[PDB]
Design a protein around this nucleic acid. Structure first.
Ligand SMILES: [Mg+2]
Ligand SMILES: [Mg+2]
Ligand SMILES: [Mg+2]
Ligand SMILES: [Mg+2]
Ligand SMILES: [Mg+2]
Ligand SMILES: [Mg+2]
Ligand SMILES: [Mg+2]
Ligand SMILES: [Mg+2]
Ligand SMILES: [Mg+2]
Ligand SMILES: [Mg+2]
Ligand SMILES: [Mg+2]
Ligand SMILES: [Mg+2]
Ligand SMILES: [Mg+2]
Ligand SMILES: [Mg+2]
Ligand SMILES: [Mg+2]
Ligand SMILES: [Mg+2]
Ligand SMILES: [Mg+2]
Ligand SMILES: [Mg+2]
Ligand SMILES: [Mg+2]
Ligand SMILES: [Mg+2]
Ligand SMILES: [Mg+2]
Ligand SMILES: [Mg+2]
Ligand SMILES: [Mg+2]
Ligand SMILES: [Mg+2]
Ligand SMILES: [Mg+2]
Ligand SMILES: [Mg+2]
Ligand SMILES: [Mg+2]
Ligand SMILES: [Mg+2]
Ligand SMILES: [Mg+2]
Ligand SMILES: [Mg+2]
Ligand SMILES: [Mg+2]
Ligand SMILES: [Mg+2]
Ligand SMILES: [Mg+2]
Ligand SMILES: [Mg+2]
Ligand SMILES: [Mg+2]
Ligand SMILES: [Mg+2]
Ligand SMILES: [Mg+2]
Ligand SMILES: [Mg+2]
Ligand SMILES: [Mg+2]
Ligand SMILES: [Mg+2]
Ligand SMILES: [Mg+2]
Ligand SMILES: [Zn+2]
Lengths: 105, 50, 49
RNA sequence: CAGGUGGGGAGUUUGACUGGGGCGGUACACCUGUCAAACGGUAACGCAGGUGUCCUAAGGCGAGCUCAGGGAGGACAGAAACCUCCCGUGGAGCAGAAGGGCAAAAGCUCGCUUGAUCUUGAUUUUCAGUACGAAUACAGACCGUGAAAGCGGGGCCUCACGAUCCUUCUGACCUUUUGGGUUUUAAGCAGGAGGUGUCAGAAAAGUUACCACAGGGAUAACUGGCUUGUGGCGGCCAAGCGUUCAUAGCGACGUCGCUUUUUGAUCCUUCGAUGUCGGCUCUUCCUAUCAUUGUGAAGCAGAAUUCACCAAGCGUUGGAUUGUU
RNA sequence: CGGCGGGUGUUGACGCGAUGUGAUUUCUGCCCAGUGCUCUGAAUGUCAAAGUGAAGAAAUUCAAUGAAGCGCGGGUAAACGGCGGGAGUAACUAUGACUCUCUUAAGGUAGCCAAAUGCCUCGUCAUCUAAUUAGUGACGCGCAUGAAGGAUGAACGAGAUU
RNA sequence: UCUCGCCCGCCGCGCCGGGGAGGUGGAGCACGAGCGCACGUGUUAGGACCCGAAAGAUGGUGAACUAUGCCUGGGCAGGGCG
RNA sequence: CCGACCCGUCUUGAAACACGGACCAAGGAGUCUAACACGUGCGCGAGUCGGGGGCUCGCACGAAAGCCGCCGUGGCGCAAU
RNA sequence: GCCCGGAUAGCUCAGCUGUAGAGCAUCAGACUUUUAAUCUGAGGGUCCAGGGUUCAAGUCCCUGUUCGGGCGCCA
RNA sequence: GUCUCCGUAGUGUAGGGUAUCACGUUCGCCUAACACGCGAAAGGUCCUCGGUUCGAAACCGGGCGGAAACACCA
């Protein structure tokens, strides 16, 4: 799918519709000091082998794309996450389609 | 799941050497002053089958 | 070893007397496994030297 | 202490449905038409199909047009290039399967846009009236569009999807961080995402004829039982064969049966066991009669043979090969 | 389990240890692509802990460096193993010496065969019998023969067969 | 917990404290009904109504049979080939 | 004379050619603890409960019963979110 | 997910923050009885894309897409 | 029977935007002639039907064949 790099949508901090820069959200790096990670490391230390399940039965081929919106107001740089439906090909601000044109021969 | 032959050989029990009728360890004489500085004479008293 | 059962030899077993795995075995194989040609640099017929 | 190697050894697992299991398939989560017996619901490894997507427009609004096809015309131009008129209830299109729906539409083309946004509840669908998903009607903001009424919180409707734990990101000049204070850090509260397709969501390869246990006739292999597709044996019609002549003897196209000496189908009995092929031996029974007794018919001169009737009294053999039937 | 513990070893390559094949005779063909094994580290890529440097107030974060192994490069099949198709073609027909291509890491060589290995199959021909799904001899596009095992060959066998 | 909005308090005038209206979440209030003891029924953990595996683990006993190595003993007519 | 298949059990279906049962005697299988829930009975009742401790000729019964009250600490209830 | 290495005349390799070179492809000449073999030349650029750092870029940084290894694996 | 694959000049094969390679065939050279060699040319509903698409040999279904692999325990 194609979505523009900017959109005018509601900003919760401003409380009104504002322009928003749109990027794609990527999962951040694991903290290694998150409580579950600490519990997992303590559990894994020692003998006993693997103590938690490892999924290894992948079935989905796509992910739900998450749009990171950022209000363009200089005093309001508030961010929001919008998820759109599952898609295989996603692009930001691609070439917009035309109607009455010739297809490449 | 069973200890193999060749593994069982190191335990020794049945795979020890048959040394009952052997005539002794075949060795040169221990080095000493005569070996180190001159020569010592011996006589071949016997030749035997080990 | 091919004439043995799988329980007492790595080469044992099978409906035909075949080794079924490469007879050349690495040097650091555990005891009970390093049977056959141990850490062989070559196999065959020695044609040349 | 750290990394590598490590079936030498250890522990464990090796889905389910299933006209037995395995192989095959997915009838395992969904959607359309039918089944389905005119409310709704309704099954089979029932039938015909589809789905794990796609779309900054194919979303939203407004405006203006009319589509498929056909007829008649126009230089090159022809069956199809473009232009014009006429007919055109949709016979087109609306992303896809199918069904429904739709014409100054919901289709096509333009213009402006982001209601595909921020929120709380209620409700419908499956339903236990639990969840998810999807959907409907509102209400409160902030907007878009249009002159306006209005319409819009995704796609005309019916499908297009995912818990706990954990992780990640976003938001509150928010709460906690353990005797007090400051600051990092961590924890929390609310909302998205990373997925469990066995789709209410374990983390999972084989082999055993060396095998074991608890059971199962809920379930196969052998008999028996229902059935008779297939096998076998008959009948009806008579186009034809029979040098002529349908029917002496046969019988195409059709069609009606019988039998359980074939092989299937099923799984009712038997899994705290009904000894599983063939041969040998021995007895009895059936007739759909090979021979023999008594007959009828012939394309019956005699001889031989063929068809049919009463008929199972009596007989139906010796061997080579093959475990064989 | 452990000790510089113990067996081979009262031993030393004509020795110990580990494999395969299985007397003699005659041979033992091609393939190092795959999986193993092994040799070399050559600039070398990756690569843990520790160590080094930097930022920070510290926890911490980052960077530099870079052991084996793995990659990269050779060898090895008496290591495990493997060893092809489709068309046309000779003055009767029939075969195909021969010729085209596609492809492999190499395309099964010498031999041997309906063999204890061949489905079709009770193969085909000959012999053995009156009659043989049996036996033997021969043939070979051989479902699916084949070389550390192939093919033979006396003597022997409470082995299978005519 | 959201949305809207205006006031009030002071030994600390504050990034202070309190109050309102309208929705919504709660296993609440709205002049108590519990506590103790006994009995019955149901569910559960325990041997768990009774009997029943194939297994798994810990620690011991066996080479008087057999398998193999070592030590020390004993034994094996009569003929053939040559 | 009429009626009458052998019981138990699993089962859609047993008299079954389904299993157990030759006969007799004795033994033989929903128990106790803990925790809940609800119902019922009793006492007191915004309270209730001494169960742990202590005091009482230390003891046939009595290892019982009686009492504590500035022993009500505490539990549950009386307030939720 | 991490460490990287790679994308460039039609094709590949090489390359300087201040004019993208070479080879393999195409074309014109010789060339050889002749084919091969060989130069003479000529034409030919994805400098893998987008944005920024840049006066100025493949060459500096992010957004990316493929390819190859070595790693890493709690919804 | 189930599952999978294939169908393109005469032959053996490559390969969503006017179908490649080699052999073969035709023509002209060279040779006394043939072959080799040299220079040119021709030759294929991409098996059949339907559909998506502006456009199908390719993508998706049906059918004609052909080719493999399974076809076990009693
Ligand atoms: Mg054996
Ligand atoms: Mg083993
Ligand atoms: Mg073996
Ligand atoms: Mg093999
Ligand atoms: Mg194991
Ligand atoms: Mg009805
Ligand atoms: Mg109905
Ligand atoms: Mg309109
Ligand atoms: Mg509204
Ligand atoms: Mg709608
Ligand atoms: Mg489920
Ligand atoms: Mg049954
Ligand atoms: Mg006639
Ligand atoms: Mg019996
Ligand atoms: Mg019997
Ligand atoms: Mg009769
Ligand atoms: Mg030997
Ligand atoms: Mg060889
Ligand atoms: Mg290294
Ligand atoms: Mg070699
Ligand atoms: Mg051969
Ligand atoms: Mg043969
Ligand atoms: Mg045979
Ligand atoms: Mg015979
Ligand atoms: Mg023969
Ligand atoms: Mg021959
Ligand atoms: Mg209850
Ligand atoms: Mg018990
Ligand atoms: Mg166990
Ligand atoms: Mg003894
Ligand atoms: Mg029973
Ligand atoms: Mg039954
Ligand atoms: Mg009964
Ligand atoms: Mg019965
Ligand atoms: Mg019985
Ligand atoms: Mg029973
Ligand atoms: Mg009995
Ligand atoms: Mg009894
Ligand atoms: Mg009694
Ligand atoms: Mg008392
Ligand atoms: Mg108190
Ligand atoms: Zn804002």
């Amino acid at each position: 799918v194609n979505v523009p790099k900017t959109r005018r949508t509601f900003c919760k901090k401003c409380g009104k519709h504002q322009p928003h820069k749109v990027t794609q959200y990527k999962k951040g790096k694991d903290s290694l000091y998150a409580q579950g990670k600490r519990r997992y490391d303590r559990k894994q230390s020692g003998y006993g082998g693997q103590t938690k399940p490892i999924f290894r039965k992948k079935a989905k081929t796509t992910k739900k794309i998450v749009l990171r919106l950022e209000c363009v107001e200089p005093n309001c740089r508030s961010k929001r996450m919008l998820a759109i439906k599952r898609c295989k090909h996603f692009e930001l601000g691609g070439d917009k389609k035309r109607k009455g044109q010739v297809i490449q021969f | 799941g069973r200890v193999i032959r060749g593994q069982r050989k190191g335990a020794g029990s049945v795979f020890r050497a048959h040394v009952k009728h052997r005539k002794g360890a075949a060795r040169l004489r221990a080095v000493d002053f005569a070996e180190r500085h001159g020569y010592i004479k011996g006589i071949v008293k016997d030749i035997i089958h080990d | 070893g091919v004439a043995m059962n799988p329980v007492e030899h790595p080469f044992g077993g099978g409906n035909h007397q075949h080794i079924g795995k490469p007879s050349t075995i690495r040097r650091d194989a555990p005891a009970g496994r390093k049977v056959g040609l141990i850490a062989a640099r070559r196999t065959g017929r020695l044609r040349g030297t």
